Scaffold this motif. Structure first.
Motif, PDB file in Angstrom:
ATOM      1  N   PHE A  84       4.093   1.605  -1.466  1.00 18.75           N
ATOM      2  CA  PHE A  84       4.885   1.620  -2.429  1.00 18.75           C
ATOM      3  C   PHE A  84       4.294   2.489  -3.695  1.00 18.75           C
ATOM      4  CE2 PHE A  84       7.317   0.165  -5.959  1.00 18.75           C
ATOM      5  CZ  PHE A  84       8.869   0.496  -5.466  1.00 18.75           C
TER       6      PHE A  84
ATOM      7  N   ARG B  11       0.582  -1.056  -0.016  1.00 17.41           N
ATOM      8  CA  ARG B  11      -0.079   0.164   0.028  1.00 17.41           C
ATOM      9  C   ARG B  11       0.981   1.368   0.080  1.00 17.41           C
ATOM     10  NH1 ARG B  11      -3.960   1.204   4.488  1.00 17.41           N
ATOM     11  NH2 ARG B  11      -4.778   2.535   2.930  1.00 17.41           N
TER      12      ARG B  11
ATOM     13  N   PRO C 115     -11.597  -0.266  -1.939  1.00 16.00           N
ATOM     14  CA  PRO C 115     -10.944  -1.541  -1.034  1.00 16.00           C
ATOM     15  C   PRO C 115     -11.124  -1.240   0.390  1.00 16.00           C
ATOM     16  CG  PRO C 115      -9.256   0.126  -2.115  1.00 16.00           C
ATOM     17  CD  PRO C 115     -10.778   0.529  -2.643  1.00 16.00           C
TER      18      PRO C 115
ATOM     19  N   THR D 274      -4.447   6.314  -1.360  1.00 14.33           N
ATOM     20  CA  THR D 274      -4.593   6.671  -2.814  1.00 14.33           C
ATOM     21  C   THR D 274      -5.913   6.509  -3.375  1.00 14.33           C
ATOM     22  OG1 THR D 274      -3.673   4.821  -3.848  1.00 14.33           O
ATOM     23  CG2 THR D 274      -2.053   6.318  -2.729  1.00 14.33           C
TER      24      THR D 274
ATOM     25  N   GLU E 121      -4.791  -2.756  -8.114  1.00 17.88           N
ATOM     26  CA  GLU E 121      -5.426  -2.444  -6.797  1.00 17.88           C
ATOM     27  C   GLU E 121      -6.175  -3.395  -5.951  1.00 17.88           C
ATOM     28  OE1 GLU E 121      -9.105   0.243  -6.425  1.00 17.88           O
ATOM     29  OE2 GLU E 121      -7.625   1.747  -7.176  1.00 17.88           O
TER      30      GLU E 121
ATOM     31  N   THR F 256      -3.093  -5.550  -4.321  1.00 19.94           N
ATOM     32  CA  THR F 256      -2.910  -4.858  -2.981  1.00 19.94           C
ATOM     33  C   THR F 256      -3.810  -5.177  -1.973  1.00 19.94           C
ATOM     34  OG1 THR F 256      -1.392  -3.215  -4.285  1.00 19.94           O
ATOM     35  CG2 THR F 256      -2.329  -2.524  -2.080  1.00 19.94           C
TER      36      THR F 256
END
Ligand SMILES: CC1(N)CCN(c2cnc3c(-c4cccc(Cl)c4Cl)c[nH]c3c2)CC1
Length: 500
Positions: free
Chosen positions: A109, A107, A463, A211, A233, A236
């Motif tokens: 990076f 998350r 998410p 993000t 996404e 992750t």
């Protein structure tokens, strides 16, 4: 962080890793590069590597020569604490996870990103302890940890520090001390043992920079941007499922084994529905494979009934005062029972243990059938209440609907029904295992509810909502395809609202 999962490895790279850096009992999991929902468990046994397929079409992870699981982390936990055989019958042991050093699914990076870019993101969106790791632009091959620290206007009470991370012979360091095999090992170390500046500031890594939170108005741009990655996404989010291995001891009890459609797809103890007022003659009468889902309107996420859990399902509906049921499977798909028929034929009356159900009327829409059911306890007439069962009938056997309009119109109707009934209990939502289509429908419902009440100028975070639902039942939302469909459904809902 799920370290035995290697997102960007080929099959021969997996073999060479296990043969040079592993021993017998070493293993890793990896995705296919072309099909999502195909995964491979690669295992070393007797100086050779075996590759075991895991398929997910939307309902569960199906390990060839093994069980069905809600998440890959629950799969790995199961076999490391137990059982896995080949075609032949030979035991395959999962003993030693082979760790991946790739940071691209973390998350925190951010790859190519500048110091002023990182500073402006941390200034606009970060708070105290918000952090990211980026690639150094001045020093190729090196990285930079950017951390906001402060109080919580731009009065100088907060700041952004940049800590250089050298990469030297594929190990990582902050200028002295320990040299780490990966950026993740470095981040976890300094999460636990934060860096202190000369003059005392603690560089606390409390949370990655968010993000994914978007204003609903800007859904279309985010969807267009993600269509060129949704897969990235999603993965992750999947990397965080290591954090959700909550206990499922009640579901694991001998007396409850027969009540689970899939032996390893089980409700968390801390959110399971506990059934009261059972038969004293039944040894364990308090169990159903079902969880309360409370967004932080509530839901019960549950499996399709078995023949021997139909009475428990109706006990549950009565006890929780549920007035709306959502079914997201046909009774039979691909020749297999997905949910037994637990309601009477139209105009018929049936007794399910102590419960009586009348089917008053069925109404067929394009995508669904509505059954108006009347539920009461035998011997107690005044307990009668109407339960509205919305049976979605057009979901495809594999994958997701190509258009979300059908699901959205169905959920709008379900919502208005629920809201029309004073003090209605949680909405029951069930498919086959009660985690894939069920999780997708519940997450779409949750997100749409926000926009319904707060309009198009409200913040959503797909998410983050899914992770919150996944902490209440295992593996809620199973596939990339469902993930993308949730975004598509939210987009379509926003567009119909803008057209009005
Ligand atoms: C530049 C980027 N590489 C783009 C993708 N970025 C990113 C961040 N966050 C998440 C989450 C997420 C959100 C809220 C809670 C939780 Cl637990 C999770 Cl996992 C899921 N996918 C994510 C992707 C990381 C920077």
């Amino acid at each position: 962080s799920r370290r035995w999962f290697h997102p960007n490895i080929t099959g021969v790279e997996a073999e060479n890793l296990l043969l040079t850096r592993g021993v017998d009992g070493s293993f890793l999991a990896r995705p296919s590069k072309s099909n999502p929902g195909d995964f491979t468990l690669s295992v070393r046994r007797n100086g050779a590597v075996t590759h075991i397929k895991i398929q997910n079409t939307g309902d569960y992870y199906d390990l060839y020569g093994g069980e069905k699981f809600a998440t890959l982390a629950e799969l790995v936990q199961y076999y490391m604490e137990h059982q896995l055989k080949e075609k032949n019958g030979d035991v395959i042991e999962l003993k030693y996870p082979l760790n991946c050093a790739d940071p691209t699914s973390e998350r925190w990076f951010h790859g190519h990103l500048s110091g002023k870019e990182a500073e402006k993101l941390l200034t606009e969106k970060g708070k105290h302890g918000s952090f990211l790791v980026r690639e150094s632009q001045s020093h190729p091959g090196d990285f930079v940890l950017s951390v906001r620290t402060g109080d919580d206007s731009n009065d100088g009470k907060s700041k952004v520090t940049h800590v250089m991370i050298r990469c030297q012979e594929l190990k990582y360091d902050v200028g002295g001390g320990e040299r780490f095999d990966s950026l993740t090992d470095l981040v976890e170390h300094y999460k636990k043992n934060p860096m202190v500046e000369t003059l005392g500031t603690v560089l606390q890594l409390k949370q990655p920079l968010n993000t994914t939170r978007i204003n609903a108005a800007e859904i279309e741009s985010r969807v267009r941007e993600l269509s060129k990655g949704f897969w990235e996404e999603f993965e992750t989010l999947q990397q965080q499922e290591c954090k959700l291995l909550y206990s499922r001891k009640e579901g694991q009890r001998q007396e409850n084994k027969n009540k689970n459609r899939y032996k390893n797809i089980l409700p968390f103890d801390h959110t399971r529905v506990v059934l009261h007022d059972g038969d004293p003659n039944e040894p364990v009468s308090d169990y159903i494979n079902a969880n309360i889902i409370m967004p932080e309107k509530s839901y019960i996420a549950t499996q399709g009934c078995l023949q021997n859990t139909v009475n428990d399902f109706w006990r549950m509906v009565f006890q929780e005062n549920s007035r709306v049921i959502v079914m997201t499977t046909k009774e039979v798909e691909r020749g297999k029972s997905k949910c037994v028929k637990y309601w009477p034929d139209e105009y018929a009356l049936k007794e399910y243990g102590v419960m009586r159900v009348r089917n008053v009327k069925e109404s067929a829409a394009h995508d669904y059938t509505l059954r108006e059911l009347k539920l009461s306890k035998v011997g107690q007439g005044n307990t009668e209440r109407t339960v509205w069962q919305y049976h979605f009938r057009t979901w495809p056997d594999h994958g997701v609907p190509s258009d979300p309009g059908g699901v959205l119109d169905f959920l709008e109707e379900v919502h208005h029904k629920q809201e029309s009934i004073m003090d209605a209990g949680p909405v029951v939502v069930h498919c086959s295992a009660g985690i894939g289509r069920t999780g997708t429908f519940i997450v779409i419902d949750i997100l749409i509810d926000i926009i319904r009440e707060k309009g198009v100028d409200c913040d959503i975070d797909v998410p983050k909502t899914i992770q919150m639902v996944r902490s209440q039942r295992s593996g809620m939302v199973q596939t990339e395809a469902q993930y993308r469909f949730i975004y598509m459904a939210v987009q379509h809902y926003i567009e119909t609202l803008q057209r009005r």
